[PDB]
């Protein structure tokens, strides 16, 4: 009944460079097994008995450790690397796994292109009304979506959801949705989508006007 | 090749019991190997619920075996999964895999089937459509479904380059889901693009055309 910690939890790495996880045990624990689970496709088997690569595995991945810590390297991380990696064990057991570790891919920045649109006259028969913003093709995960409604800053009735990375390209999208009421709506005239992100030091606006 | 798919019901109400099955193909569970089940999310966290060997039985479940059962239709060549008492806690993605002998390690997975303990009511989604900005990028809005999952495709599955569903998110037990897709300015809008929208819990099926409004 010993807990798994894998840190980190995520990660990036470019093509070439050493990449090192970790996985701690509560307490000691007699050799450990790592599994590789590429996005869309079962889990297999990496190593076994701490250091033991499965055949079929390439030679760049390296198991170590010792007690309660535990150690997965590749010696140059190649694209096809990026995925998640658990850990598990079974010594002083019931067997248990780690939450396992995310290695995503580095790549070149890029901006996102970034779409609005208005509620659709079905919705606002409803009435509701929710303007959603798509950022979409982005490297940084990390961007900073802002409403405003009139110049004011909504903050509350947004709901943002980003995708994995892109298995064509590295790159990631995302969209923001204000929700509000039909009346709410009406009641206002310019709806602003901005969008901040490494790629550019002034924000990206994208606007429409009722 | 041997496959195994999981099976069993999408939404199930709290303290009720919780019933799902292991189907395997290219292989008999009698003839060796101990077909598990496990369960993972939403954190990520795992947990391995136990197994049923070969031999029948000889089963075991982790220290949590009160509320636990695993089964088998060797003549249906399946396994079953019977967790009684099922609250909210319950609720994750099971998984029924086979243990390879000797190497200690699972070599075979099903798909995973996720399952929702609330008492929340099936709602069927609405469908919007978003017509569309800077070269033409289009999308779809569903919203105020319970539960998860719906199924949303671009011209029956044929559209599938610059397309981008994004992951549902719950506001208040009801889930809202969206996606775009990006065609070039003589694409759209004198070729049709329509999105298709399925939510089996509420057998709800609409296709909605992105017209230029």
């Known amino acids: 009944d010993i807990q798994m910690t894998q840190s980190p939890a995520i990660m990036s790495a470019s093509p070439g460079e050493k990449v090192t996880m970790t996985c701690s045990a509560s307490?000691?624990?007699?050799?450990m097994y790592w599994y590789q689970q590429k996005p869309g496709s079962s889990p297999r088997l990496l190593i076994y008995?701490?250091?033991n690569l499965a055949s079929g595995v390439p030679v760049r991945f390296s198991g170590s450790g010792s007690g309660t810590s535990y150690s997965l390297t590749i010696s140059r991380m190649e694209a096809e690397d990026a995925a998640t990696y658990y850990c598990?064990?079974?010594?002083?057991?019931?067997?248990?796994f780690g939450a396992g570790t995310k290695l995503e891919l580095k790549r070149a920045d890029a901006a996102p292109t970034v779409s609005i649109f208005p509620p659709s006259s079905e919705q606002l028969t409803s009435g509701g009304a929710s303007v959603v913003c798509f950022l979409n093709n982005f490297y940084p995960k990390d961007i900073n979506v802002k409403w405003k409604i009139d110049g004011s800053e909504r903050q509350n009735g947004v709901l943002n959801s980003w995708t994995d990375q892109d298995s064509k390209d590295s790159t990631y999208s995302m969209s923001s949705t204000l929700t509000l009421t039909k009346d709410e709506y009406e009641r206002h005239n310019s709806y602003t989508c901005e969008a901040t992100h490494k790629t550019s030091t002034s924000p990206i606006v994208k606007s429409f006007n009722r | 090749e041997v496959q195994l798919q999981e099976s069993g019901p999408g939404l199930v109400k709290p303290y009720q019991s919780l019933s799902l099955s292991c189907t395997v193909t290219?292989?008999?569970?009698?003839?060796?190997?101990?077909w598990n089940w496990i369960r993972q999310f939403p954190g990520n966290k795992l947990e391995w619920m136990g197994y049923?060997?070969?031999?029948?039985?000889?089963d075991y479940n982790p220290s949590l075996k009160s509320r636990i059962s695993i089964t088998r239709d060797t003549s249906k060549n399946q396994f079953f999964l019977q967790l009684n008492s099922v609250t909210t806690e319950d609720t994750a993605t099971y998984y029924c895999?086979?243990?390879?002998?000797?190497?200690?390690?699972?070599?075979?997975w099903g798909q995973g089937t996720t399952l929702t303990v609330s008492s929340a009511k099936t709602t069927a989604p609405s469908v919007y459509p978003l017509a569309p900005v800077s070269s033409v990028t289009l999308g779809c809005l569903v919203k105020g479904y319970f539960p998860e999952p719906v199924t949303l495709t671009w011209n029956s599955g044929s559209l599938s380059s610059g397309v981008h569903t994004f992951p549902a998110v719950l506001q208040s037990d009801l889930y809202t889901l969206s996606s775009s897709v990006t065609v070039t300015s003589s694409t759209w809008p004198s070729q049709s693009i329509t999105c298709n929208v399925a939510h089996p819990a509420s057998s709800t099926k609409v296709d909605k055309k992105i017209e230029p409004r």
């Open positions: 895999a086979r243990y390879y002998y000797g190497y200690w390690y699972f070599d075979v």
């Open positions: 290219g292989y008999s569970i009698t003839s060796d190997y101990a």
């Open positions: 049923i060997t070969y031999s029948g039985t000889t």
């Open positions: 307490s000691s624990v007699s050799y």
């Open positions: 008995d701490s250091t």
């Open positions: 598990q064990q079974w010594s002083t057991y019931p067997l248990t």
